[PDB]
């Protein structure tokens, strides 16, 4: 079955790149040691002194996360080079890292070889230290740097050519603004030709790059359809397309029937900034985020390039490693069971031996092709029994072209077929997520295509369960109800320990008539979730309101357990001013140790700041205040406030006196509770 291709087609190196699916950035240079996202160029190389670098750890941590390549920023915009280049001493050769000089590029490419992951380079065309930048001599220097990187560090699978500029820089002390004709300065054709002479197996990235294109954003999403084909058009009509001179937002979806084959890379950072920042340790993308990113990039037909910036300790930070390990666990669960492996494949037609069955081995080299006859080609998978799934994966033999243009996927439930998902492009691969179904039949219908269609993979998958922390709710009876999105086991503790994997399971609403602390956690297939911790106050069903201004709002709205219900003293007669008091008969002698005041959410009107609480056992003699003070920072942060008693008191009657407020001049209590440890 030697079938006729559909121009354009990818090359062998582009096919390998596609099959990689995903790979990593490592933004690491002197800016990592300045705190800047873009360096100026005046940095002393003294400042590149990573304490405890270790490249094996770096590459291994990335490879365990499933990334198949590492792209190192060998020189970023600041112009400082991570290897002892012969073009400048604004390199590691000047740094105290190592006795004078080591070589980060050598170590990272060596570890990439050590762990079977590809190695690629980023060499910023815009050099902000080279005093020759703007003159042809900088082009000579840049060509020598590219030769050095492409001569002594093994195979390079991708070279990353950033088209971004921005003008000013140190430029060897010039401290000047320089601009270059981006569409002609770097003379890209010859530089890239020489590079691909000494690295025939490499792939060129840039906004136009003859091999891989930029997705046109840095937020981490390609657009569906994300055609691999692409025809760059310039920003300024007439100029010649080049990195930084093309309508780049068009690179988010590609071009329908393009003239060239430049598939898309989704470069995105695990953190807001491309380089390591300490104040971003709390903003590292969660594994669920990274999986969503994986779909919105890989599962749309593009490839993923996640940036993991080593800190200025020279290591991937602990948060980054935690998130990467979680992301690997989630990708592994996603591909635990292929609900198509074991199925039968049928087709509306076939051509010269490429039968339907050929889509079950997931291999991109074996494929089904329809006959140039039926205008509605289709592929049916029949399953051994109804199976629970929600994700389909489709793939084309892209080496023969990209053919599918509009397509749908129908599922068979309860004996009947209904439409489940649809789309436009397939290309390298597409992950379609639909409604969760229990089905034993899948139909892929290729509605329209320019050339006789073909598929190399049809596989079925269950999207991993998002383990959201358990909701812990309670009524005025102490009846506690735990809940979560379905199909999760919930463990819980009431003493104060953390919910270990051997803690009490949740089953039905349980009781806690003393007031305490609940800590719950969700579980599914060995993977845990965040721990919800909730303090349950004492029951309030025997509580009656003994004293409190009624002519405006019913005081029972402050002990009804609903924070969205409001007691106030803002009657149509007047804004009756503080102090406003609530005397509560608790119905039973309670051993109170804390008082909870829940203010209103939407406003700061009526919220109290200075408070007094009296306790008694007859409601007639109160005495000195049982507690006393202010609610510091309740204006900007109106949340439930806790009055811890200096010493626990046993009492039946409680008087809460709001003495004065934050804004307005009536008192407003949303809820009022009591804790008795
Ligand atoms: Ca196949
Ligand atoms: Ca209330």
Author numbering: 29 to 705
The authors write:
Although crystallization attempts of both AmGH29C/D were carried out, we could only determine the structure of AmGH29D, the most complex fucosidase structure to date. Unique to this structure is that the GBLD domain is joined to a linker domain and a C-terminal CBM32. The linker domain and the CBM32 adopt an extended conformation, which positions the CBM32 binding site above the catalytic domain. This juxtapositioning of the linker-CBM32 domain relative to the catalytic domain, which resembles a Cobra strike pose, is observed in the GH33 sialidase from Micromonospora viridifaciens, suggesting convergent evolution to a similar putative mucin-binding motif. The GBLD and the CBM32 assume the same fold, despite less than 22% shared sequence identity. The position and the surface chemistry of the putative binding sites of the GBLD and the CBM32 domains are different, suggesting their possible functional divergence. The catalytic site of AmGH29D is similar to the closest characterised counterpart from Streptococcus pneumonia, but differs by being flanked with a flat positively charged surface, compatible with binding sialylated or sulfated glycans at the mucin surface. Notably, shorter and more flexible loops result in a more open active site in AmGH29C as compared to AmGH29D. Notably, only AmGH29C, but not AmGH29D, showed activity on the double sulfated terminal Lex epitope highlighting the overall broader epitope specificity of AmGH29C.
The mucolytic human gut microbiota specialist Akkermansia muciniphila is proposed to boost mucin-secretion by the host, thereby being a key player in mucus turnover. Mucin glycan utilization requires the removal of protective caps, notably fucose and sialic acid, but the enzymatic details of this process remain largely unknown. Here, we describe the specificities of ten A. muciniphila glycoside hydrolases, which collectively remove all known sialyl and fucosyl mucin caps including those on double-sulfated epitopes. Structural analyses revealed an unprecedented fucosidase modular arrangement and explained the sialyl T-antigen specificity of a sialidase of a previously unknown family.
